[PDB]
């Protein structure tokens, strides 16, 4: 055949892949964590959005830390050979590097480690996307008015994309009626640009939407008039388009 290029992930496998959505709204009383009103709006929005992208969506609600780990372990042990990618969306309370099960914390690294290049062979070389809607700390953004070769191996941390809802160390905002700022924006941008733009460019539009169109309203001066900027963390090695051929 003619000249060939390998700058984009192969997304024409028989299946796009799984989209696991963990929606934690109600937490055990003993933890002292508040209910996350509006998260069901996010979960439904994500289900519809990824369904249209042809992902096999699996929604899970109110999972304990043990159930989250068991779920991730089991999913990573499935045969993903006929799948192009993997998507996991986490909706819960959190802090830097941590997501909360209904009864306690789970290290994000523990979850993502199950999908390492060396631990999930059927996903090696394929994009593994983790969308995280959770706090990463307690900071508030006040805003501002405007040679050698051989034995071909790849890093076990390669091909991961972490789309965080907020910057490191910051709270993440969620509206009890409309859903989280980030998920609202992410779904809107995927619906409009998934058949046109490369994923990083779609996420950049999400960054702009969240950064410009949202500002908190609170009777508490400490939490009033605050802003938010999502954080795209890419260890991907190729361009990612949800469409093909």
């Amino acid at each position: 055949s003619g000249i060939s290029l390998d700058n984009s992930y192969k997304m024409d496998y028989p299946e796009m892949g799984l989209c696991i959505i963990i929606n934690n709204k109600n937490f055990h009383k003993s933890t002292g964590m508040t209910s996350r009103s509006g998260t069901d709006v996010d979960a439904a929005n994500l289900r519809e959005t990824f369904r249209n992208l042809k992902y096999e969506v699996r929604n899970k609600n109110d999972l304990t830390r043990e159930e989250i780990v068991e779920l991730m372990r089991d999913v990573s042990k499935e045969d993903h050979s006929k799948r192009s990618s993997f998507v996991c969306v986490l909706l819960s309370h959190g802090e830097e590097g941590i997501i909360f099960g209904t009864n306690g914390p789970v290290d994000l690294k523990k979850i993502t480690n199950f999908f390492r290049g060396d631990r999930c062979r059927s996903l090696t070389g394929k994009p593994k996307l983790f969308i995280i809607q959770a706090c990463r700390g307690t900071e508030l953004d006040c805003g501002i008015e405007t040679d050698d070769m051989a034995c071909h191996k790849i890093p076990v941390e390669a091909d991961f994309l972490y789309a965080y809802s907020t910057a490191p160390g910051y709270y993440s905002w969620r509206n009890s009626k409309d859903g989280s700022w980030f998920i609202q924006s992410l779904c809107a941008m995927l619906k409009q640009y998934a058949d046109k733009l490369e994923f990083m460019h779609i996420l950049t539009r999400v960054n702009r939407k969240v950064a410009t169109e949202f500002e908190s309203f609170s009777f508490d001066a400490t939490f009033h008039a605050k802003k938010q900027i999502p954080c795209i963390v890419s260890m991907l090695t190729k361009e990612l388009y949800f469409y093909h051929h």
Binding site: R36, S37, G38, H93, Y171, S172, W173, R174, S176
Partner: peptide
């Protein structure tokens, strides 16, 4: 508006 609420924080997570």
């Amino acid at each position: 508006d609420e924080v997570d």
